[PDB]
Design a binder for this molecule. Structure first.
Ligand SMILES: [Mn+2]
Length: 354
């Protein structure tokens, strides 16, 4: 069977992380050969850059065309830039097939997509003074980069409008955690932790996968192959049920990038209310769930509220986050801010892609 997966991408600066490359990674994620309902893509933008937000909006709109195309004709890789670079043998066909016209159409619409991304970049290339204004008319909450409220925006998924074939697409969530003067944010680490919490509130998939913003998925089946190991040259795998003391794997394991791993390993918990996890009833509830998921009773809105709450600024204060929970904040000794901490304690599984 196929378990839900939450996929994290972290970006920080559109000027060293070109929006188009991020777009291609995201498009490779949204087109993944896996049940649409059970794959979700969270994109932390630590820079709160409207260029990124809009590029992401654009990306989702293009995904509406690109994803059904890929699934219909079994395309790989499912990141457009690298797909259209693979040379094709047109000579082998006597006449234009339906595939190649679908595809010439598609490439054209992708080149148009690129053009509007370039437009966004260039438009951004010199600061307006009164700050950026949304296509709405309301001011952009991210303009003050070290001083701005939490932002979450969900694209696609169940109420983000179908693809070109009337089918739904995976959730695509924009997240920019609160930044305030006087609070540390611990960089990518504090970002991964906040994404753990947000994803827990919105979807709560039993597995997590963290990809760099330039790591596009090579093979649309990557998640299925991973599940072929996670539930009963070569790549990195790890499985452990650790009862026990002295036998087997001792202590924590640290997982970085490109690896599907089980969520609950993050959480401590030997087989109490205690806010070790910070104060959010919804979140700890989520940590106490068998096979992940949210209570369907909750409505998209008020859980959007608690999702904004778990990325507030000082949520982690007086909590184990960054200390013994999640991605671990460094410069003391641990030699981390390099991975998610998987506690020995209980069930642990990792499948990494090549
Ligand atoms: Mn802190």
């Amino acid at each position: 069977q196929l378990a839900a997966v939450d996929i994290f991408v972290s970006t920080v600066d559109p000027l060293k992380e070109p929006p188009l490359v991020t777009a291609n990674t995201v498009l490779s994620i949204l087109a993944v050969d896996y049940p649409v309902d059970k794959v979700s893509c969270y994109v932390s933008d630590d820079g709160a850059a409207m260029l990124s937000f809009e590029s992401l909006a654009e990306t989702s709109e293009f995904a509406r065309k690109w994803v059904p195309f890929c699934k219909k004709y079994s395309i790989e890789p499912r990141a457009p830039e690298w797909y259209f670079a693979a040379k094709i043998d047109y000579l082998k066909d006597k006449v234009q097939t339906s595939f190649v016209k679908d595809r010439r159409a598609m490439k054209r619409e992708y080149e148009e997509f690129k053009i509007r991304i370039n437009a966004l970049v260039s438009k951004a290339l010199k600061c307006p003074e009164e700050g950026w204004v949304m296509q709405d008319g309301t001011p952009w909450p991210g303009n003050n980069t070290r001083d701005h409220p939490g932002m979450i925006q969900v694209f696609l998924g169940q109420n983000g409008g179908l693809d070109a074939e009337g089918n739904e697409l995976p959730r695509l969530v924009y997240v920019s955690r609160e930044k305030r003067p006087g609070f540390q944010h611990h960089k990518k680490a504090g970002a991964m932790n906040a994404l753990v919490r947000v994803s827990a509130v919105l979807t709560n998939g039993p597995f997590i996968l963290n990809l760099d913003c330039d790591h596009y998925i090579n093979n649309s089946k990557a998640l299925r192959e991973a599940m072929c190991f996670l539930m009963d040259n070569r790549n990195t795998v790890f499985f452990d049920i650790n009862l026990r003391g002295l036998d087997g794997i001792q202590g924590p394991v640290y997982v970085g990038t490109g690896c599907v791993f089980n969520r609950t390993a993050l959480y401590g918990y030997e087989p109490s209310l205690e806010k070790r996890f910070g104060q959010s009833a919804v979140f700890v509830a989520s940590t106490l769930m068998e096979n992940g998921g949210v209570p369907p009773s909750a409505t998209p809105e008020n859980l959007l509220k608690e999702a904004i709450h778990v990325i507030s600024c000082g949520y982690e204060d007086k909590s184990d986050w960054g200390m013994e929970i999640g991605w671990i904040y460094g410069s003391v000794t641990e030699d981390i801010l390099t991975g998610f901490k998987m506690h020995a304690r209980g069930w642990r599984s990792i499948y990494c892609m090549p």
